Amino acid sequence: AXCXX
Amino acid sequence: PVLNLNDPQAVERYEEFMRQSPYGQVTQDLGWAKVKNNWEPVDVYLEDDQGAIIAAMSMLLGDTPTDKKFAYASKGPVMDVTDVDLLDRLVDEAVKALDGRAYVLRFDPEVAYSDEFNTTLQDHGYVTRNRNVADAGMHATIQPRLNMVLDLTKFPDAKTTLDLYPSKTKSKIKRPFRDGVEVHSGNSATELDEFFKTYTTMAERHGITHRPIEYFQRMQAAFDADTMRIFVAEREGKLLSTGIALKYGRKIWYMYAGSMDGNTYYAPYAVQSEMIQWALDTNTDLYDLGGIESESTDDSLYVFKHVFVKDAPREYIGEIDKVLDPEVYAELVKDG
DNA sequence: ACCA
């Protein structure tokens, strides 16, 4: 959840 | 048409379109479904009158707290999304393939935000998520909308990373190498283990969430060393910093990274210099350092990436939502 | 200091 990717 | 993933000839035709398109994205490659192995893949495409593929959309379906799936085409579709009449036709094919199972189809292509484009998408019935949700920060959208992208086509004669930069930045980039930092790269289990040690250390230092090693093993299995490359910075046999870059379409993308605790001698700048060098050596148009929260010195991501990107960050159109079940959409998505 |  945190940088996407 | 819908792609039959069990048909290797169709799959290879789909992949050749993906790999050769100027709109291609690693997260639209079918290899990305192998990374996201907890999602369900559904892939569609359109053909021209000669039967050649002209547009494709790779979707991954995820669960929700409702009876509906979330359908997501990360950084897709692969076509000119400003050609909205063609976009509508591809989205219609995707919607057929979803067969009522999803409440939304979301796609977030790397196309600049503009008022005219936002208005056209809304005119065509899409729900867009961009400046209207900006207050929620970087994670208002799944991928960051603001991205720090180095346009190498502005420097057609550059041979090395230093050729891209003013003297003051040349000095910053030279400094790790002057102090003994050396970078190697590869896509073997050895470099993956080195990356993972720095990645977990970074995550624990920041108290943030981090992916299991099997995620990156699936990535390494899906993509060869001409696509995925892990860059590892050391100083006299001491591991300092790493980063994973993916080369696909018009860009090389700095996607994951980490540094050990302690003195790292600006090793992350050496990692950047070598990924940029990889972009130069392969005549790649763009080097993407990825997201920032805001164009502000208060943002540590912006400060770091501004060392390498002096142009303004690119601001994308954000999330484009084809709403399919509007009741569940309003339950699960807030429009800011 | 963060350099993800």
CA distance B57 to B91: 8
Beta-ladder partners of B251: B248, B286
Distance from CA of B180 to the nearest CA of A (A): 31
User: Structure resolution in Å?
Assistant: 1.6
> Annotated catalytic sites of B, by residue?
36, 108, 211, 304-305, 319
Interface touch A4/B144, C-beta < 8 Å = yes
Using alpha carbons, select from B181, B277, B185 the residue that is nearest to residue B238.
B181
Strand C and B303 CB separated by under 7 Å:
yes
Using alpha carbons, select from B265, B261, B244, B229 the residue that is nearest to residue B195.
B244
**Which single residue is written with the structure tokens 């896509």?**
B187
B146 and B129 in contact (C-beta within 8 Å)? Answer: no
Residues 36-65 of B with CB under 7 A from strand C: none
First-last CA distance in chain B: 35
**Mapped to the 3 state alphabet, what secondary structure does chain B carry?**
CECCCCCHHHHHHHHHHHHHCCCCCHHHCCHHHHHCCCCEEEEEEEECCCCCEEEEEEEEEECCCCCCEEEEECCCCECCCCCHHHHHHHHHHHHHHHCCCEEEEEECCCCECCHHHHHHHHHCCCEEECHHHHHHCHHHCCCCCEEEEEEHHHCCCCCCHHHHCCHHHHHHHHHHHHCCEEEEEECCHHHHHHHHHHHHHHHHHHCCCCCCHHHHHHHHHHCCCCCEEEEEEEECCEEEEEEEEEEECCEEEEEEEEECCCCCCCHHHHHHHHHHHHHHHCCCCEEEEEECCCCCCCCHHHHHHHCCCCCCCEEECCEEEEECCHHHHHHHCCCC
Measured between beta carbons, the chain A residues lying within 8 angstroms of B143 are: 4-5
Q: Give helix B167-178 / helix B267-281 axis angle, nearest 10°.
A: 110
Q: Which nucleotide is nearest to B272 (CA to C1')?
A: C3
CA distance B114 to B98: 29
Distance in Å, residue B304 CA to nucleotide C2 C1': 9
Coil, helix or strand at residue A4: coil
Strand order in the sheet with B228-235: B181-186, B228-235, B238-248, B251-259, B286-291, B146-151, B314-315
Using alpha carbons, select from B83, B9, B23 the residue that is nearest to residue B57.
B23
B315 and B161 in contact (C-beta within 8 Å)? Answer: no
Measured between beta carbons, the chain A residues lying within 8 angstroms of B209 are: 1-2
User: Which long-range contacts link B293-302 to residues 24+ away (Cβ below 8 Å)?
Assistant: B293/B137, B293/B138, B293/B144, B293/B146, B294/B146, B295/B146, B301/B148, B302/B148
Method for structure elucidation? X-ray
Using alpha carbons, select from B240, B241, B236, B218 the residue that is nearest to residue B228.
B218
